[PDB]
Scaffold this active site. Structure first.
Site, PDB file in Angstrom:
ATOM      1  N   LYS A   1     -13.500  -8.497   5.675  1.00 45.87           N
ATOM      2  CA  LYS A   1     -12.222  -8.647   5.064  1.00 45.87           C
ATOM      3  C   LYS A   1     -12.075 -10.098   4.606  1.00 45.87           C
ATOM      4  O   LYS A   1     -11.895 -10.348   3.422  1.00 45.87           O
ATOM      5  CB  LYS A   1     -11.109  -8.223   6.028  1.00 45.87           C
TER       6      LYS A   1
ATOM      7  N   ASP B   1      -1.537  -5.194   1.768  1.00 42.73           N
ATOM      8  CA  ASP B   1      -0.842  -3.986   2.245  1.00 42.73           C
ATOM      9  C   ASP B   1       0.628  -4.303   2.571  1.00 42.73           C
ATOM     10  O   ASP B   1       1.498  -3.426   2.460  1.00 42.73           O
ATOM     11  CB  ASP B   1      -1.519  -3.359   3.471  1.00 42.73           C
TER      12      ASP B   1
ATOM     13  N   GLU C   1       0.855  -1.182   0.000  1.00 39.79           N
ATOM     14  CA  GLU C   1       0.000   0.000   0.000  1.00 39.79           C
ATOM     15  C   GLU C   1       0.899   1.242   0.000  1.00 39.79           C
ATOM     16  O   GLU C   1       1.892   1.305   0.728  1.00 39.79           O
ATOM     17  CB  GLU C   1      -0.971   0.020   1.188  1.00 39.79           C
TER      18      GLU C   1
HETATM   19  C1  LIG Z   1      -9.083   2.941   2.924  1.00 34.14           C
HETATM   20  C2  LIG Z   1     -10.143   2.574   2.092  1.00 34.14           C
HETATM   21  C3  LIG Z   1     -11.211   3.459   1.980  1.00 34.14           C
HETATM   22  C4  LIG Z   1     -12.322   3.180   1.186  1.00 34.14           C
HETATM   23  C5  LIG Z   1     -12.361   1.986   0.476  1.00 34.14           C
HETATM   24  C6  LIG Z   1     -11.283   1.097   0.569  1.00 34.14           C
HETATM   25  C7  LIG Z   1     -10.177   1.379   1.376  1.00 34.14           C
HETATM   26  C8  LIG Z   1      -9.129   0.460   1.458  1.00 34.14           C
HETATM   27  C9  LIG Z   1      -8.895  -0.219   2.662  1.00 34.14           C
HETATM   28  C10 LIG Z   1      -7.852  -1.134   2.781  1.00 34.14           C
HETATM   29  O1  LIG Z   1      -7.701  -1.692   3.877  1.00 34.14           O
HETATM   30  C11 LIG Z   1      -7.028  -1.370   1.649  1.00 34.14           C
HETATM   31  O2  LIG Z   1      -5.990  -2.265   1.762  1.00 34.14           O
HETATM   32  C12 LIG Z   1      -7.248  -0.702   0.415  1.00 34.14           C
HETATM   33  C13 LIG Z   1      -6.470  -0.894  -0.742  1.00 34.14           C
HETATM   34  O3  LIG Z   1      -6.621  -0.179  -1.775  1.00 34.14           O
HETATM   35  O4  LIG Z   1      -5.601  -1.789  -0.764  1.00 34.14           O
HETATM   36  N1  LIG Z   1      -8.315   0.215   0.338  1.00 34.14           N
HETATM   37 MN   LIG Z   2      -5.827  -2.631   4.287  1.00 30.39          MN
HETATM   38 MN   LIG Z   3      -4.137  -2.549   0.607  1.00 35.38          MN
END
Ligand SMILES: Cc1ccccc1-c1cc(=O)c(O)c(C(=O)O)[nH]1
Ligand SMILES: [Mn+2]
Ligand SMILES: [Mn+2]
Length: 175
Positions: free
Chosen positions: A116, A90, A62
């Site tokens: 998740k 991530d 990430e």
């Molecule tokens: C942070 C967030 C906000 C709105 C929709 C998705 C995400 C999000 C959460 C995560 O835990 C994540 O690993 C991602 C990602 O893009 O990898 N995106």
């Molecule tokens: Mn995440």
């Molecule tokens: Mn991620």
């Protein structure tokens, strides 16, 4: 405004990154303020988590553009043999030798955990709340309590900083 708080309480690299990620996908952080503030908070978790560690323990994914992210993933698999995820995680753990998905929720930790788990398939899951609560696959929390303490506090701080500005309720309810 929420947006003020974000630029006011997060190192710019993160704000820069959150802004890039949103605006490239046609989202305005001046409008989607609670999302702006959620993306930041995730990134910081992820960066923090990465840098609490065999000197170089974790691989940050990430943060990276999608070319780089899948490069690093394809690099990791090709040399460790660990299966490719369907969705970009991530982190990777070079010690426990598996990917991590970091979740941060304003709801309960078991709920966000199921969400998740449901989506992914052999990636470790770790959830942090803003209430100093966490839950992780096999309750394998992956980090020396020392480090996990620092995230919990930061998140709680971010929670409590929002509440100083009467911003918590807005934020809490937008997940
Ligand atoms: C942070 C967030 C906000 C709105 C929709 C998705 C995400 C999000 C959460 C995560 O835990 C994540 O690993 C991602 C990602 O893009 O990898 N995106
Ligand atoms: Mn995440
Ligand atoms: Mn991620």
């Amino acid at each position: 405004a929420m947006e003020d708080f974000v630029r006011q309480c997060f190192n710019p690299m993160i704000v820069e990154l959150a802004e890039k990620a949103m605006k490239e996908y046609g989202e305005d952080p001046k409008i989607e303020t609670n999302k702006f503030a959620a993306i930041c908070t995730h990134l910081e978790v992820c960066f923090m988590y990465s840098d609490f560690g065999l000197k170089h323990r974790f691989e940050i994914i990430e943060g990276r553009d999608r070319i780089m992210a899948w490069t690093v993933v394809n690099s990791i698999c090709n040399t460790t043999g660990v299966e490719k995820p369907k969705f970009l995680p991530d982190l990777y753990d070079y010690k426990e030798n598996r990917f991590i998905e970091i979740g941060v929720t304003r709801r309960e930790v078991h709920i966000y955990y199921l969400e998740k788990a449901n989506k992914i398939e052999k990636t470790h899951i770790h959830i942090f709340s803003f209430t100093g609560e966490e839950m992780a696959t096999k309750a394998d929390y992956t980090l020396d309590e020392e480090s996990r303490a620092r995230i919990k506090t930061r998140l709680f701080t971010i929670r409590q900083e929002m509440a100083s500005r009467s911003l918590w309720d807005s934020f809490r309810q937008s997940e």
